Design a protein around this ligand. Structure first.
Ligand SMILES: CC(C)CCC[C@@H](C)[C@H]1CC[C@H]2[C@@H]3CC=C4C[C@@H](O)CC[C@]4(C)[C@H]3CC[C@]12C
Ligand SMILES: CC(C)CCC[C@@H](C)[C@H]1CC[C@H]2[C@@H]3CC=C4C[C@@H](O)CC[C@]4(C)[C@H]3CC[C@]12C
Ligand SMILES: CC(C)CCC[C@@H](C)[C@H]1CC[C@H]2[C@@H]3CC=C4C[C@@H](O)CC[C@]4(C)[C@H]3CC[C@]12C
Ligand SMILES: CC(C)CCC[C@@H](C)[C@H]1CC[C@H]2[C@@H]3CC=C4C[C@@H](O)CC[C@]4(C)[C@H]3CC[C@]12C
Ligand SMILES: CCCCCCCC/C=C\CCCCCCCC(=O)OC[C@H](O)CO
Ligand SMILES: CCCCCCCC/C=C\CCCCCCCC(=O)OC[C@H](O)CO
Ligand SMILES: CCCCCCCC/C=C\CCCCCCCC(=O)OC[C@H](O)CO
Ligand SMILES: CCCCCCCC/C=C\CCCCCCCC(=O)OC[C@H](O)CO
Ligand SMILES: CCCCCCCC/C=C\CCCCCCCC(=O)OC[C@H](O)CO
Ligand SMILES: CCCCCCCC/C=C\CCCCCCCC(=O)OC[C@H](O)CO
Ligand SMILES: CCCCCCCC/C=C\CCCCCCCC(=O)OC[C@H](O)CO
Ligand SMILES: CCCCCCCC/C=C\CCCCCCCC(=O)OC[C@H](O)CO
Ligand SMILES: CCCCCCCC/C=C\CCCCCCCC(=O)OC[C@H](O)CO
Ligand SMILES: CCCCCCCC/C=C\CCCCCCCC(=O)OC[C@H](O)CO
Ligand SMILES: Nc1nnc(-c2ccc(O)c(Cl)c2)c(-c2ccccc2)n1
Ligand SMILES: CCCCCCCC/C=C\CCCCCCCC(=O)O
Ligand SMILES: CCCCCCCC/C=C\CCCCCCCC(=O)O
Ligand SMILES: CCCCCCCC/C=C\CCCCCCCC(=O)O
Ligand SMILES: CCCCCCCC/C=C\CCCCCCCC(=O)O
Ligand SMILES: CCCCCCCC/C=C\CCCCCCCC(=O)O
Ligand SMILES: CCCCCCCC/C=C\CCCCCCCC(=O)O
Ligand SMILES: CCCCCCCC/C=C\CCCCCCCC(=O)O
Ligand SMILES: CCCCCCCC/C=C\CCCCCCCC(=O)O
Ligand SMILES: CCCCCCCC/C=C\CCCCCCCC(=O)O
Ligand SMILES: CCCCCCCC/C=C\CCCCCCCC(=O)O
Ligand SMILES: CCCCCCCC/C=C\CCCCCCCC(=O)O
Ligand SMILES: CCCCCCCC/C=C\CCCCCCCC(=O)O
Ligand code: NA
Length: 389
C-alpha cells in the first residue's frame, strides 16, 4: 500500500491544471460575447450560461472534488453540500445544451417568427429559471434523500471525527439510487436523448428544405423546356401555371424585384397562351431565362448558403452536446455498475479519479470548439489575445 499522498498529489495536480484551463478558456468566451455585438444573440446567451457553469467548475467544483477526495472529517450535511454542488453545475449545463438545441430548431423550422418568439429578455428569464431548477435538482439530497441518517461510524471513529461528523466521501453521503435513477436516468439521460431527437429534427428539416429549394429550381427549368418544345397553346398554359404557383412558393428589395419580374413575365406569357398565340407565348417565356440568370439563381444560391451555415452551426452545437455526453457517461456508467452489480468489485480508485478528471475536462473543451468551428468567436478571441495578453 503506497502512501496515499503520492497518488493523491497526481490527482490534485491534474485537477488544478484543469481548473486553470477551464477558467481561462471560458472567461475568454464570456469576454468575447461581451465585446462583440455580432456574438450577442439568444443562442450565445445560453453559451455564456454554459461557460459560467464551466467557470464555476474550476472555481468551486474542482476545489470541492479535491476536498472530498481526502475523506476529511466534516458535518455530514456540509459534506453533502460540497459533494452535490457539481450536480448543480452539470444540471445547469444540460439545461443550457437543451436550450441551444431548441433555439437552433426554432430558427431552422420557423425562421419567419424566430425573432418575435425567441428574444433576449425571455432568454434571460429562461436562464434564471434553469439555474434555480439546477440547484433544486442538484441539491435534492440536501432535502433528505441522503445517507446522513446512517453514517459510517467505524470509518468516522477510525479517522478521529467528532460527534455528528463523517469522513467526507461522495459515495458515503450521496445515495446511489439518487445518482442512478434520479440524477442519471431522469435528469441526465432523458434530456440528452431529447437533445438527440431535437438535432435529428434539425438535420432532417434542413435536408428537406434544401431538397425543396432544388425541386423548385428543377421545376422552373423543366417547365421552361416544356414550353419550348410545345406545339399548342394549351401545353404552354399548363407549364406556365405550374411555374407561376412554384414561383410564389419559392418567393416565400433586389429579391422582391426579381420575383416581381418573374411572376409578371409568367402572367404575360399566360395571357398570350390563353389567346391561342403559341409562338408569342413561347418567345415571352424565353424572357424568363434572363430573370432566372440575373435574380432567381442568386436567390437560390443565397438561400442554399444560409441553410448550409445553419447546418454547420447545428453540427458545432451538436459536437458540444456529444462531448458533454462522452465526458460524463463513464462516471454514470461506473455508478450503474456499483449500484446494479453488488457482486462486482467496486471500480478501483484510480479509475474513479480518471472518470472525474475526464468529466472536469469537458469544462475545458468548449472554448476550443468555438474557436475551431465558429469564425466570429475565433476572430474575437484573436483580438482579445493580441490586444490584452
Ligand atoms: C461566494 C462563494 C465564493 C462562497 C463559497 C462558500 C463555500 C466555500 C463554503 C459554503 C458552505 C461551506 C461548508 C459548510 C459546512 C461544512 C461542514 C464542516 O464540518 C466542514 C466544512 C464545510 C463542508 C464547509 C466548507 C466550505 C463551504 C462549502
Ligand atoms: C444556494 C443555497 C443552497 C443557499 C446558499 C447558502 C449556502 C451556501 C450555505 C448557507 C448556510 C449553510 C448551511 C448552514 C448549516 C449547516 C448545518 C451543518 O450541520 C452542516 C453545513 C450546513 C448544511 C451548511 C451548508 C451550506 C449552507 C446551506
Ligand atoms: C464511450 C464511453 C462513454 C464508454 C465508457 C465505458 C467505460 C466507462 C466502461 C467500459 C468497461 C467498464 C468496466 C468493465 C468491468 C468492470 C469491473 C467491475 O468489477 C467494476 C466496474 C468495471 C471496472 C467497469 C467500469 C466501467 C467501464 C470502464
Ligand atoms: C449511452 C446511452 C445511449 C445508454 C446508457 C447505457 C447504460 C445505461 C448501460 C450500458 C451498459 C450497462 C451495464 C452493462 C452491464 C451491467 C452488469 C450487470 O451485472 C448489471 C447492469 C450493468 C451495470 C449495466 C447497467 C446499464 C448500463 C451502464
Ligand atoms: C455557494 C456557491 C455559490 C456560487 C454562486 C452561484 C452561481 C449561480 C448562478 C450564476 C449564473 C450566471 C449566469 C449568467 C448568464 C448570463 C446571460 O446569459 O446573459 C443573458 C443576457 O443578459 C440577455 O440579455
Ligand atoms: C461567475 C461566473 C461568471 C459568469 C457570468 C459572466 C457574465 C458575462 C456576461 C456576458 O458575457 O454577456 C453579456 C450580454 O451578452 C450583453 O447583452
Ligand atoms: C491554488 C492552490 C495551490 C495548491 C493547493 C493544494 C491543495 C491540497 C490540499 C490538501 C490535500 C491534502 C492531501 C491529503 C490526501 C490524503 C490521502 C488520501 O487520498 O486519503 C483519502 C481516503 O480515501 C480517505 O478515507
Ligand atoms: C473568488 C471565487 C470565490 C471563492 C471560492 C471559494 C474557494 C473555496 C476553496 C476551497 C473549498 C474547500 C472547502 C472545504 C475545506 C474543508 C477543510 C476543513 O474544514 O478541515 C477541518 C475539518 O474539521 C476537517 O476535520
Ligand atoms: C434554490 C435557489 C438558489 C438560488 C439560485 C440562484 C440563481 C441565480 C442567478 C441566475 C442568473 C440569471 C441571470 C440572467
Ligand atoms: C435548495 C435547497 C438547498 C438547501 C440548503 C440548506 C441545507 C441545510 C442543511 C442542514 O440543515 O443541516 C443539517 C442539520 O444541521 C443536521 O442536524
Ligand atoms: C425537482 C424540483 C422541481 C420543481 C417544480 C416546480 C418548478 C416550477 C416550474 C416552472 C416555473 C415556470 C416559471 C414561471 C415564471 C413566470 C413566467 C412568465 O411570467 O411568462 C410570461 C411571459 O411574458 C411569456 O412571454
Ligand atoms: C425550497 C426548498 C427549501 C428546502 C429547505 C432546506 C432544508 C433542508 C434540511 O434542513 O433538511 C435536513 C434533512 O436532510 C431533511 O431530513
Ligand atoms: C431513459 C430511461 C431509462 C430508464 C429505464 C430503467 C428501468 C430500470 C428498472 C430496474 O432496474 O429494476 C430494478 C432492478 O431490480 C435492479 O435493481
Ligand atoms: C437505460 C437502461 C435501463 C436499465 C438498465 C439497468 C438494469 C440493471 C438491473 C439488473 C440488476 C440486477 O438484477 O441484479 C441482479 C442480482 O444482483 C442477481 O440476482
Ligand atoms: N461515485 C461517484 N463519485 N464521485 C463523483 C464525483 C464527485 C465530484 C465531482 O466533481 C465529480 Cl465530476 C464526480 C460521482 C459523480 C458521478 C456523476 C455525476 C456527478 C458526480 N460519482
Ligand atoms: C483525457 C482526460 C484525462 C486526463 C488524464 C490524466 C491522467 C491521470 C489523472 C489522474 C487519475 C489517476 C491518478 C492516480 C491516483 C491513484 O492511483 O489513486
Ligand atoms: C500560458 C499560461 C498558463 C498558466 C500557467 C499555470 C499552470 C499551472 C497548472 C498546474 C500546476 C499545479 C500546481 C500543483 C502544486 C502542488 C499540489 C500538490 O502536490 O498537492
Ligand atoms: C483553455 C485555454 C484558453 C486560454 C488561452 C489564454 C487567453 C485567455 C486570457 C483571458 O482572457 O483570461
Ligand atoms: C470568477 C468569474 C469570472 C467571470 C469573468 C467574465 C468577464 C466578462 C464579462 C464581465 C463584464 C465586463 C466587466 C468590465 C467591462 C469593462 C468594459 O466593458 O470596458
Ligand atoms: C480564483 C479562486 C479559486 C479558489 C482557490 C482554491 C484553490 C485551493 C485548492 C483546493 C482546496 C483544498 C481543500 C483542502 C482539503 C483539506 C484536507 C484535510 O483537511 O484533510
Ligand atoms: C426550490 C426551487 C423549486 C421550484 C422552481 C421554480 C422555478 C424557478 C422560479 C423562478 C425563476 C425566476 C425568474 C422568472 C422570470 C421569467 C422571465 C421570462 O421568462 O421572460
Ligand atoms: C432513443 C430516442 C431518441 C430520439 C427519438 C427521435 C425522434 C425524432 C426523429 C424523427 C424526427 C424527424 O427527423 O423528423
Ligand atoms: C454519445 C455521444 C457520442 C459521441 C459525440 C461526439 C460528437 C457527436 C456529434 C455529431 C456531429 C454532427
Ligand atoms: C479511449 C480508450 C481509453 C484510452 C485510455 C484510458 C484507459 C482506460 C481505463 C480503464 C478501462 C477499464 C479498466 C479496468 C478496471 C479494472 C477492473 C477491476 O479490477 O475491477
Ligand atoms: C489515459 C490514462 C489512464 C491511465 C491511468 C493509470 C493510472 C492507474 C495506476 C494503476 O494501474 O494502479
Ligand atoms: C476529451 C475531448 C478530447 C478532444 C476534443 C477537444 C479538442 C477540440 C479541437 C477541435
Ligand atoms: C490531464 C490533462 C489536463 C487538461 C486536458 C485538457 C485537454 C482537452 C482540451 C483541449 C484539447 C486541445 C485542443
Ligand atoms: Na459544463
Amino acid at each position: 500500500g503506497a502512501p496515499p499522498i503520492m497518488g493523491s498529489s497526481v490527482y490534485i495536480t491534474v485537477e488544478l491544471a484543469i481548473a486553470v484551463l477551464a477558467i481561462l478558456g471560458n472567461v475568454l468566451v464570456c469576454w468575447a460575447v461581451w465585446l462583440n455585438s455580432n456574438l450577442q444573440n439568444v443562442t450565445n446567451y445560453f453559451v455564456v450560461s454554459l461557460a459560467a457553469a464551466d467557470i464555476l467548475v474550476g472555481v468551486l467544483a474542482i476545489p470541492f472534488a479535491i476536498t472530498i477526495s481526502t475523506g476529511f472529517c466534516a458535518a455530514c450535511h456540509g459534506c453533502l453540500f460540497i459533494a452535490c454542488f457539481v450536480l448543480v453545475l452539470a444540471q445547469s449545463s444540460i439545461f443550457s445544451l437543451l436550450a441551444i438545441a431548441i433555439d437552433r430548431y426554432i430558427a431552422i423550422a420557423i425562421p419567419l417568427r424566430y425573432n418575435g418568439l425567441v428574444t433576449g429578455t425571455r432568454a434571460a428569464g429562461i436562464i434564471a429559471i434553469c439555474w434555480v431548477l439546477s440547484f433544486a435538482i442538484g441539491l435534492t439530497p440536501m432535502l433528505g434523500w441522503n445517507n446522513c441518517g446512517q453514517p459510517k461510524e467505524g470509518k468516522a471513529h477510525s479517522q478521529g471525527c467528532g460527534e455528528g461528523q463523517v469522513a467526507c466521501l461522495f459515495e458515503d453521503v450521496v445515495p446511489m439510487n439518487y445518482m442512478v435513477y434520479f440524477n442519471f436516468f431522469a435528469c441526465v439521460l432523458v434530456p440528452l436523448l431529447l437533445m438527440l431527437g431535437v438535432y435529428l429534427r434539425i438535420f432532417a428539416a434542413a435536408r428537406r428544405q434544401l431538397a425543396d429549394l432544388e425541386d423548385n429550381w428543377e421545376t422552373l427549368n423543366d417547365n421552361l423546356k416544356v414550353i419550348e418544345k410545345a406545339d399548342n397553346a394549351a401545353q404552354v398554359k399548363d407549364a406556365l401555371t405550374k411555374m407561376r404557383a412554384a414561383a410564389l412558393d419559392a418567393q416565400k428589395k433586389d429579391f422582391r424585384h426579381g420575383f416581381d419580374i418573374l411572376v409578371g413575365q409568367i402572367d404575360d406569357a399566360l395571357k398570350l397562351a390563353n389567346e391561342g398565340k403559341v409562338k408569342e407565348a413561347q418567345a415571352a417565356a424565353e424572357q424568363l431565362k434572363t430573370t432566372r440568370n440575373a435574380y432567381i439563381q442568386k436567390y437560390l444560391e443565397r438561400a442554399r448558403s444560409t441553410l448550409q451555415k445553419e447546418v454547420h452551426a447545428a453540427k458545432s452545437a451538436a459536437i458540444i452536446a456529444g462531448l458533454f455526453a462522452l465526458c460524463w457517461l463513464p462516471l454514470h456508467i461506473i455508478n450503474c455498475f456499483t449500484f446494479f452489480c453488488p457482486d462486482c468489485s467496486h471500480a478501483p480508485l484510480w479509475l474513479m479519479y480518471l472518470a472525474i478528471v475526464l468529466a472536469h475536462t469537458n469544462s475545458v473543451v468548449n472554448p476550443f470548439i468555438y474557436a475551431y468551428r465558429i469564425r466570429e468567436f475565433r476572430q474575437t478571441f484573436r483580438k482579445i489575445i493580441r490586444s490584452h495578453v
